């Protein structure tokens, strides 16, 4: 667990872009966006 | 142990608590069957 | 090739590329009044001099991580990669540490660095790690080597977080190459010799006339004037002049004759400049050009040596003493020399 946490904190791009980083706010907005992507079929593979 | 406190603090700084409770509060719909490939 | 020892003043310098332009910065801190650390542009010193007095840091002790853990449970040593160093502020006297607060809401994973009074706890020490492939763990550090600082408790790198207008250093998880530049290696600096980067006072051998400025009895227009005084002013605070050497490496070296240096008034924070249209005045760092502020010390009145030496890599040789030394100030552009006058009219001369 310690080394996995070390690697995940040294490489921040392993987390989601809408949760970690100077873009998306956090997990709340990330998963609400995910729900709305699930709801609208215009963002999938036809 | 101190490194345990450090790891817990890192995890808390990563994932806040308000975010956690807001994500818990979604109140998924419970259905005529539905699809299990969603939330 | 010189190995970093213990109890020596160093500078934590780093490189930053902004506007596709390179700049070199200190790790600096005011200390008294502001705990957090900031940056100081050590480069571009021809027009604005940096504040080396808050740029520099001293290595208090140098112990390994396991010896530090044993100290937690309970001469001049050399510096090796992997040790857990202790950085103390030279002026403020406090110790550089990792604060448990987060000021920048952008990087929600880092902490802020600053100065603290006590050294207890593992939240103040730092560990050096190699930054290049040529160098590994366990070898001796030399001058100019790039290293990485990691906190002991926070376990976070001394990151140079780039911002829109907040060039602030944090303890983040992104490595930042922090080069070290020595200042004073703690050599055999005898009691009484002149060392660069120091503040001092200048008196006369037979008149005890000290180079001062008017006190706070008037405004800054009056305090900007420079003159001589005597009596109790020798022990005042408005009569201290600090010599800032131009080079940032080994700025706390022994002052040799004929080298340029800036004259700063630590009481107001202005630098002693010379404009040809008048006498000398005090101008802030924003316009303190080197060609107008850099003065030098000579042993005689002549111009035998002007373009001789540019730099010497080392602590230097003990030349100028505090006890018996008769120096002459000389400007790099005009080459004028100090002279006392009798501009004071006879109306209130004896009392003023």
From Swiss-Prot, chain B:
Disruption phenotype: Embryonically lethal. Embryos die at about 10 dpc, due to defects in heart tube development. Cardiac myotubes display enlarged rough endoplasmic reticulum and cytoplasmic vesicles that contain high levels of Ca(2+). Channel activity is modulated by phosphorylation. Phosphorylation is increased in failing heart, leading to calcium leaks and increased cytoplasmic Ca(2+) levels. Highly expressed in heart, lung, cerebellum and brain. Detected at lower levels in adrenal gland, stomach, thymus, esophagus and ovary. It is found in: Sarcoplasmic reticulum membrane. Belongs to the ryanodine receptor (TC 1.A.3.1) family. RYR2 subfamily. The calcium release channel activity resides in the C-terminal region while the remaining part of the protein resides in the cytoplasm. Homotetramer. Can also form heterotetramers with RYR1 and RYR3. Interacts with CALM and S100A1; these interactions regulate channel activity. Identified in a complex composed of RYR2, FKBP1B, PKA catalytic subunit, PRKAR2A, AKAP6, and the protein phosphatases PP2A and PP1. Interacts directly with FKBP1B, PKA, PP1 and PP2A. Interacts with FKBP1A and FKBP1B; these interactions may stabilize the channel in its closed state and prevent Ca(2+) leaks. Interacts with SELENON. Identified in a complex, composed of FSD2, CMYA5 and RYR2. Cytosolic calcium-activated calcium channel that mediates the release of Ca(2+) from the sarcoplasmic reticulum into the cytosol and thereby plays a key role in triggering cardiac muscle contraction. Aberrant channel activation can lead to cardiac arrhythmia. In cardiac myocytes, calcium release is triggered by increased Ca(2+) cytosolic levels due to activation of the L-type calcium channel CACNA1C. The calcium channel activity is modulated by formation of heterotetramers with RYR3. Required for cellular calcium ion homeostasis. Required for embryonic heart development. This is Ryanodine receptor 2. The chain holds residues 2412 to 2459 of 4966 of the full protein.
